[PDB]
Design an enzyme around this catalytic site. Structure first.
Site, PDB file in Angstrom:
ATOM      1  N   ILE A   1       8.686 -60.250 -31.387  1.00 34.69           N
ATOM      2  CA  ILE A   1       7.296 -60.730 -31.962  1.00 34.69           C
ATOM      3  C   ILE A   1       7.550 -61.304 -33.256  1.00 34.69           C
ATOM      4  O   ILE A   1       7.225 -62.482 -33.803  1.00 34.69           O
ATOM      5  CB  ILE A   1       6.113 -60.364 -31.651  1.00 34.69           C
ATOM      6  CG1 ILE A   1       5.972 -60.311 -30.051  1.00 34.69           C
ATOM      7  CG2 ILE A   1       4.872 -61.028 -31.899  1.00 34.69           C
ATOM      8  CD1 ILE A   1       6.334 -61.284 -29.164  1.00 34.69           C
TER       9      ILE A   1
ATOM     10  N   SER B   1       0.120 -57.343 -33.767  1.00 30.00           N
ATOM     11  CA  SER B   1       0.369 -58.119 -32.572  1.00 30.00           C
ATOM     12  C   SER B   1       0.369 -57.355 -31.400  1.00 30.00           C
ATOM     13  O   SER B   1       1.450 -57.238 -30.663  1.00 30.00           O
ATOM     14  CB  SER B   1       1.825 -58.815 -32.942  1.00 30.00           C
ATOM     15  OG  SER B   1       2.583 -57.706 -32.915  1.00 30.00           O
TER      16      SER B   1
ATOM     17  N   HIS C   1       6.063 -59.951 -14.469  1.00 32.05           N
ATOM     18  CA  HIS C   1       6.515 -59.928 -15.889  1.00 32.05           C
ATOM     19  C   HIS C   1       7.958 -59.553 -16.368  1.00 32.05           C
ATOM     20  O   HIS C   1       8.399 -58.792 -15.611  1.00 32.05           O
ATOM     21  CB  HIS C   1       5.324 -58.921 -16.487  1.00 32.05           C
ATOM     22  CG  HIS C   1       5.207 -58.770 -17.910  1.00 32.05           C
ATOM     23  ND1 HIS C   1       6.354 -58.721 -18.986  1.00 32.05           N
ATOM     24  CD2 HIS C   1       4.165 -58.953 -18.823  1.00 32.05           C
ATOM     25  CE1 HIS C   1       5.770 -58.311 -20.124  1.00 32.05           C
ATOM     26  NE2 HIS C   1       4.542 -58.743 -20.158  1.00 32.05           N
TER      27      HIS C   1
ATOM     28  N   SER D   1      -2.993 -58.946 -26.265  1.00 28.16           N
ATOM     29  CA  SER D   1      -1.416 -59.116 -25.464  1.00 28.16           C
ATOM     30  C   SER D   1      -1.060 -60.171 -24.951  1.00 28.16           C
ATOM     31  O   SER D   1      -1.666 -61.434 -24.829  1.00 28.16           O
ATOM     32  CB  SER D   1      -1.361 -57.898 -24.736  1.00 28.16           C
ATOM     33  OG  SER D   1      -1.980 -58.059 -23.430  1.00 28.16           O
ATOM     34  N   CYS D   2       0.009 -60.302 -24.660  1.00 27.94           N
ATOM     35  CA  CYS D   2       0.560 -61.726 -24.029  1.00 27.94           C
ATOM     36  C   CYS D   2      -0.098 -61.812 -22.636  1.00 27.94           C
ATOM     37  O   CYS D   2      -0.532 -62.952 -22.336  1.00 27.94           O
ATOM     38  CB  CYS D   2       2.428 -61.326 -23.725  1.00 27.94           C
ATOM     39  SG  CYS D   2       2.822 -59.909 -22.852  1.00 27.94           S
TER      40      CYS D   2
ATOM     41  N   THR E   1      -0.595 -53.034 -17.733  1.00 23.99           N
ATOM     42  CA  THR E   1      -0.548 -54.443 -18.380  1.00 23.99           C
ATOM     43  C   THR E   1      -1.862 -54.217 -19.418  1.00 23.99           C
ATOM     44  O   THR E   1      -2.921 -53.756 -19.208  1.00 23.99           O
ATOM     45  CB  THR E   1      -1.200 -55.514 -17.473  1.00 23.99           C
ATOM     46  OG1 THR E   1      -1.138 -56.650 -18.198  1.00 23.99           O
ATOM     47  CG2 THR E   1      -2.362 -55.306 -16.950  1.00 23.99           C
TER      48      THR E   1
ATOM     49  N   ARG F   1       9.229 -47.217 -16.703  1.00 28.26           N
ATOM     50  CA  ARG F   1      10.045 -47.574 -18.007  1.00 28.26           C
ATOM     51  C   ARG F   1      11.172 -46.907 -18.241  1.00 28.26           C
ATOM     52  O   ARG F   1      11.992 -47.529 -18.939  1.00 28.26           O
ATOM     53  CB  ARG F   1       8.923 -47.808 -18.992  1.00 28.26           C
ATOM     54  CG  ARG F   1       8.020 -48.913 -18.637  1.00 28.26           C
ATOM     55  CD  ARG F   1       7.124 -49.088 -20.298  1.00 28.26           C
ATOM     56  NE  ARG F   1       5.916 -50.006 -19.995  1.00 28.26           N
ATOM     57  CZ  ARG F   1       5.412 -50.924 -20.838  1.00 28.26           C
ATOM     58  NH1 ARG F   1       5.956 -51.552 -21.718  1.00 28.26           N
ATOM     59  NH2 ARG F   1       4.430 -51.559 -20.463  1.00 28.26           N
TER      60      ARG F   1
ATOM     61  N   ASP G   1      11.493 -53.812 -41.852  1.00 29.83           N
ATOM     62  CA  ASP G   1      12.184 -53.547 -40.959  1.00 29.83           C
ATOM     63  C   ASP G   1      13.125 -52.190 -41.304  1.00 29.83           C
ATOM     64  O   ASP G   1      14.021 -52.291 -42.412  1.00 29.83           O
ATOM     65  CB  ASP G   1      12.928 -54.484 -40.081  1.00 29.83           C
ATOM     66  CG  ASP G   1      13.274 -54.142 -38.613  1.00 29.83           C
ATOM     67  OD1 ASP G   1      12.445 -54.435 -37.768  1.00 29.83           O
ATOM     68  OD2 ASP G   1      14.151 -53.206 -38.649  1.00 29.83           O
TER      69      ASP G   1
END
Lengths: 334, 333, 334, 334
Positions: free
Chosen positions: A13, A120, A178, A150-151, A211, A198, A34
């Protein structure tokens, strides 16, 4: 006079938001934070597996990297309260690390000297959760910390708004089929957050999961709060996703064509409409937050009782990123 | 000795059925029909991408091939009225080509001399559609042609039976998140049956599509005929699938625990129960027709109105194949 | 006004050739032949998994489709001799079906009324085999049937020419780590041509196989005929490939830098040069026939004896397609 | 005597070695160290994407988990010198974390009370590197720290030994077409060790990289030290790999059949031989360290000069793990 943006977290993102800002007049990225070297940051901006080569020139310079002639300062600071946002005159921070997803946590950028922070991801605390073109007009300009949702929330909100405005939403369940994400594992391995699903090889499995839309949505459209729920199946595509929503409506002589026509009438820069038989790779790079797919509308009727099903596509990377940059520009415009 | 099986079409289901038949001491394949050379047949039996090596010995011999000692005759017949089923004393044909999915078409094997045909797909015509341990007791032994339903129908039926028996099914929609199959294209290309989505690169897309189970289930559980519908999303795993069912029930103070406990009580050799956070690859090779996943049960309530969601895993290959070989042995018994 | 092109076989290369020709003035496709309906032809032109959406507008008509108003006539003809090439004034046919890969077989298009045929594959018979910018100047304009070689041959030829011209090629072995192609199977299944390895699930395996480059290359560079051989490992990427060539040279105090510098000096529109640490998805959509990668040059020395290894990337789809359209334009310009 | 094994790092090799060990008499794992909860450890032992389901019951109890009625103690200790190897009478530690790949670093287990340590990776320092059935007879029983080499080194050693013993190796280059591993990234992302190629989406690219075999063969077969080199192409299969070796030999009228027959004569428990046209998924779960494939042998001759090419498959997971457990059992048997 350009809005000055700092990006914390140069992941999918972050990097994609950098790309979009290169094309949005009046917005400039002046700093990136970062925990990696600049040679890595420049390289990952330049080359992108699913999203393509960056067009312009990128070069590594001593305090940062030059992009199309412009200097971008890069810092390597993990307490966000130590960032030189005051010296650099930062208007908005795009908070894309995943580690500041809460109002109080995010105020670290504000202590550091940024004017506003757009997160984000969904976030806890006393803040507004915003899907551009669904509830961005809730923003009155006094906000210091905002969530960009979220997306999936972004793919869902405009569909769910049409359903409820036009037909009345009683209740509904959701599944997003997804794309796998960076926090999924490459090989079966201990997962950081203890999620046993995950933990599994991302690109070799259908993997049930949570989600971020399941809760975020009611914050975006308060009048359906509590009325929707669901989850995800993470599958082996690297980007591109589909939201399936199964609903019970107030109106009960609804048709496929009524539903499709209503979505089309609501279409805009954030909400696309299509009657082509497309697949996931066909939305890679798209900038609609959501693309309603008429070819997928189903209506099930047994006597007086109807179940209605709809689907909307989204690039969980670029759809979400474009939504978030739209919110950014609007947030900075008042 | 033994029920004599002939397999027509040595594809995924045909080969897996042979393979499954090798796990079932007393069932024997005496013949295979397919339009390909024996060296290719033996090789594909022997090596399997998702299902692993055939451990027993396979060798190619003059009239066909020898498997772990036993001779299996092979043929290159394009039709199935010309097959020597009469000379070979075939009890049951497993019809797995996909080209005889109809009662009248499939009677070719019967003209040819087989005693019965079990079709490995939903089929049109005057025949019973059978999901083992859901409705196999509808078979009374007078049938010549029978359908084994589809892989998805086999995953759905025992879940839907519990939901309707225990709580009363009003209506429901289905989505199977489904492994890509061999009739999907490798690269974006013209598709044979004209399906613009099956035309696309199978392993690079989420691809919406139709499902057998959509039409086959009412034939399996007549009392819910017309109450269910749905489809598929073909995704980039080569085998392993998941059926999500979203239902409205008659009973309306239903709980997650109520639903889970009811599925558990109905578990058997065809219908498994899990509370483990598994993923698709974890059901590769499994022999349940359906594996109910308690971790995925959802119940949505707004006032007096409830939507209930459930999910069940299946190896669209071996789940289905194991269901079909159960029916085959029952049909012959 | 324009060279008139007919495409026979609207597969990966056929469809991609159609898209390249929209970017090159002087070429227009006036006809397409394939055994499928128009709605399928228009759809697959419009949407493409690895190469992205077709930018322009595509609409269907009976017996064709229109593209930005330009009419493209479509056909369904398995024996190329019945096609109405004569009525349509076809200058060159791109032969991409895979079923006419021989000089005598391909003359069917010539009987049908086309002026020339360029075969998008290696081909048997009395014809020249052409890799643009390696041996296209062999064409003197009297040819009616020409082979455009293969995707791998097109990656290999300019690299092998430099090695031979500058150093003297004694012998060499080749492996192409190669994207899976549409004639591989989706699932383990009987293969049409009896190839036990192309029978296997294309996207779940490393699959040894033949390459068209081992026989085609001596026809392209005669002076090394018989000196090179090798094959492929088909791997689970949908497009993007890499040719590794391991050679013995005549000169025997060769260095990494001498090899690299020589490739760079030969670089052109068909032959690119990179020192970036790219991966396969980075060449998706590229229009070089070959991209020499200096980061992968190896020289092994034990006393007076040297083995030299080099690597070149190619998009086995768009590199090859771009090469083929270059040959097509040249063939029609003579 | 059940030899008592502790596994440090319960990743792919760690979990797979636990699984092998249960199939082999004389060895028993009594402890596992990893930085994750037990519910996670039990689950990942139980379910396995590529290798299938552990046969046997696994339940979570207190100090670890129960396997077939046997208690396995688990720990979550980052400082290994702090592991209670002394209280638990550990004979051998299988070091599978990737953070102790050096002789001095690994002696921490020895200070902690273990008798020996076998490192599941190449390793620096004063230690022997062992490929079972190639050089295990170098072990005289006085070793405290030993390296089990790498997965590729294990595929390579018995092939290279035959080539050198039978024909004399002059020099050679290697490429392993290699399954992606767990230290590769799921999505384009900053890599931990700064590798710009391992940073890229593992399952969407062909990715050039280094191999441990290039550094590890000379230590295993000293008489060919410095004569081989090469690397890897990481490709989108989750396990299953292939080593291609291209060599110049001393004997120079060598044939395909000579090379093949010599490999077959050397075949054993560690070194299999096949003439079947198999692909990568066909070696998943195999327990040979290397499987020579005769169908892929090539010989290239131009006058008096030959290049010879060979290929050996390996399950980079289970081949390596079976090799490592054979060394473990031998190391403990001396």
């Amino acid at each position: 006079m350009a809005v000055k943006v700092a990006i914390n977290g140069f992941g999918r993102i972050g990097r994609l938001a950098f790309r979009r800002i290169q094309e949005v007049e009046g917005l400039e990225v002046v700093a990136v934070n970062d925990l990696t070297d600049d040679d890595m940051l420049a390289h990952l901006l330049k080359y992108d597996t699913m999203q393509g080569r960056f067009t312009g020139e990128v070069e590594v310079v001593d305090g940062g990297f030059r992009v199309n002639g412009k200097e971008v300062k890069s810092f390597s600071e993990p307490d966000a309260s130590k960032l030189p946002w005051k010296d650099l005159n930062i208007d908005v921070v795009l908070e894309c690390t995943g580690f500041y997803t809460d109002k109080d946590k995010a105020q670290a950028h504000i202590e550091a000297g940024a004017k506003k922070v757009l997160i984000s991801a969904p976030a806890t605390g006393d803040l507004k959760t915003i899907v551009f073109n669904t509830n961005h007009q809730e923003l009155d300009g006094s906000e210091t910390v905002v969530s960009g949702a979220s997306c999936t929330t972004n793919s869902l909100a405009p569909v769910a708004k049409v359903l409820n405005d036009d037909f009345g939403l009683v209740e509904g369940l959701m599944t997003t089929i997804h794309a796998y994400t960076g926090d999924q594992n490459t090989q079966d391995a201990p997962h950081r957050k203890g999620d046993k699903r995950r933990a599994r090889a991302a690109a070799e499995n259908i993997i049930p999961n949570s989600t971020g839309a399941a809760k975020a949505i009611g914050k975006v459209i308060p009048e359906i709060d509590g009325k929707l729920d669901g989850g995800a199946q993470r599958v082996p595509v690297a980007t591109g996703s589909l939201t399936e929503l199964t609903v019970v409506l107030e109106k009960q002589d609804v048709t496929v064509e009524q539903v499709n026509e209503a979505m089309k009438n609501a279409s805009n820069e954030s909400f696309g409409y299509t009657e082509d038989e497309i697949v996931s790779s066909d939305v890679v790079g798209m900038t609609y937050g959501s693309l309603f797919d008429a070819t997928q509308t189903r209506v099930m009727s047994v006597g007086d009782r109807q179940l209605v099903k709809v689907a909307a596509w989204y690039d969980n990377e670029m759809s979400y990123t474009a939504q978030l940059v739209r919110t950014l520009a609007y947030l900075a415009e008042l």
